[PDB]
Amino acid sequence: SVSSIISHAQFDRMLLHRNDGACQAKGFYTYDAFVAAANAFPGFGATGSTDARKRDVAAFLAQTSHQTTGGAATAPDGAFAWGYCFKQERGAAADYCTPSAQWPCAPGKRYYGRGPIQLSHNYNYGPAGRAIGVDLLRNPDLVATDPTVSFKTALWFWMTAQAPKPSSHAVITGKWSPSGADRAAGRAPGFGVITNIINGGLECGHGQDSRVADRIGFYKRYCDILGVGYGDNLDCYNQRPFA
Numbered sequence: 001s002v003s004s005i006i007s008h009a010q011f012d013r014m015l016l017h018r019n020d021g022a023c024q025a026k027g028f029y030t031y032d033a034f035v036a037a038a039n040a041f042p043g044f045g046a047t048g049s050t051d052a053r054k055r056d057v058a059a060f061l062a063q064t065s066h067q068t069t070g071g072a073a074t075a076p077d078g079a080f081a082w083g084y085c086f087k088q089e090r091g092a093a094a095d096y097c098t099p100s101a102q103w104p105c106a107p108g109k110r111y112y113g114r115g116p117i118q119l120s121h122n123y124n125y126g127p128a129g130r131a132i133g134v135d136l137l138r139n140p141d142l143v144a145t146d147p148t149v150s151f152k153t154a155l156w157f158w159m160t161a162q163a164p165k166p167s168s169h170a171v172i173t174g175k176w177s178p179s180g181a182d183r184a185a186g187r188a189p190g191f192g193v194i195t196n197i198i199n200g201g202l203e204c205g206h207g208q209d210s211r212v213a214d215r216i217g218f219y220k221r222y223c224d225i226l227g228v229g230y231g232d233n234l235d236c237y238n239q240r241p242f243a
């Protein structure tokens with residue numbers, strides 16, 4: 001299903017420079033791990049028309065490519081050939097432990113960005129771990145050391161609604177109906193609101209933002225490679241964050 005939408009050759013063309021010496025994650029991210037992870041989430045790249053499936057895969061890889069980018073405008077083959085360069089948040093400044101009864105933080109552990117989606121916060125490591133059958137509150141480092149677990153956490157985030165946010169998967173496959181609150185916030189279906197779902201607090205609703213732009217650059221390149229249109233509403237420059 002994922003392999004029916006994106007081949008090993010297409011995966012490598014997209015993630016062209018991930019195994020450069022300039023990349024910390026060199027050798028970590030493999031096509032096999034990506035495919036293995038996708039087996040845990042049967043709807044991913046397998047929901048809707050062939051175009052919707054292509055957008056699902058392209059948007060996933062584009063958003064995650066930005067999360068982990070080592071790109072620069074004048075980098076070899078352009079900024080959008082340098083996704084999946086990192087696997088751990090650079091100079092992570094925080095524990096990212098927001099106390100709650102639901103997701104207790106493990107002593108001495110930190111929930112900074114790890115893996116393709118740069119999964120952060122105890123409140124994401126908790127449910128991600130539960131979904132994949134691995135205790136990620138106690139062993140968050142596993143997101144940075146096991147490639148299959150790494151991709152699975154990213155797909156978990158992609159596929160999972162967290163009210164009032166829909167899943168990014170639902171958005172990109174055209175299965176999301178904005179609420180009245182969404183309409184008032186200027187959140188229309190498209191790649192843009194996915195950026196908002198992932199990191200809208202820091203990136204959205206304040207006009208031009210180079211991180212938002214970077215995500216779109218990867219998306220357009222990956223859509224061109226798979227042979228699919230981008231859809232509408234690619235940015236979140238004028239979207240209020242979800243909270």
Ligand SMILES: CC(=O)N[C@@H]1[C@@H](O)[C@H](O[C@@H]2O[C@H](CO)[C@@H](O[C@@H]3O[C@H](CO)[C@@H](O[C@@H]4O[C@H](CO)[C@@H](O)[C@H](O)[C@H]4NC(C)=O)[C@H](O)[C@H]3NC(C)=O)[C@H](O)[C@H]2NC(C)=O)[C@@H](CO)O[C@H]1O
Nearest residue numbers: 022067068069070071072086088089090113118210211214
């Ligand atoms: C003046 C000049 O041209 N200098 C060159 C440098 O720009 C260049 O180094 C590269 O610089 C870009 C920014 O310009 C940098 O891009 C950033 O990459 C990080 C790491 O992936 C991203 O951080 C993620 O952000 C998201 C939020 O958006 C977090 O959720 C996530 O946790 C973060 N991930 C990690 C792993 O920490 C930044 O978002 C991204 N910035 C932007 C604006 O997109 C590249 O990583 C730099 N590349 C390298 C290899 O360090 C340098 C090399 O080309 O050359 C200088 O001359």
Ligand SMILES: CC(=O)N[C@@H]1[C@@H](O)[C@H](O[C@@H]2O[C@H](CO)[C@@H](O[C@@H]3O[C@H](CO)[C@@H](O[C@@H]4O[C@H](CO)[C@@H](O)[C@H](O)[C@H]4NC(C)=O)[C@H](O)[C@H]3NC(C)=O)[C@H](O)[C@H]2NC(C)=O)[C@@H](CO)O[C@H]1O
Nearest residue numbers: 113117118119120123124162164198199200201241242243
């Ligand atoms: C400093 C820095 O660079 N940090 C980056 C991280 O912030 C980023 O991880 C993403 O972080 C945002 C928060 O900024 C997070 O989004 C939050 O998600 C929670 C849980 O879904 C929401 O909390 C719920 O809100 C509703 C109301 O809206 C409540 O009813 C409900 O009870 C809340 N649940 C809990 C458990 O508190 C937040 O509202 C929401 N905030 C925003 C602004 O959207 C994302 O999930 C994080 N994304 C990921 C992939 O982890 C990370 C990745 O970009 O990079 C760090 O560098």
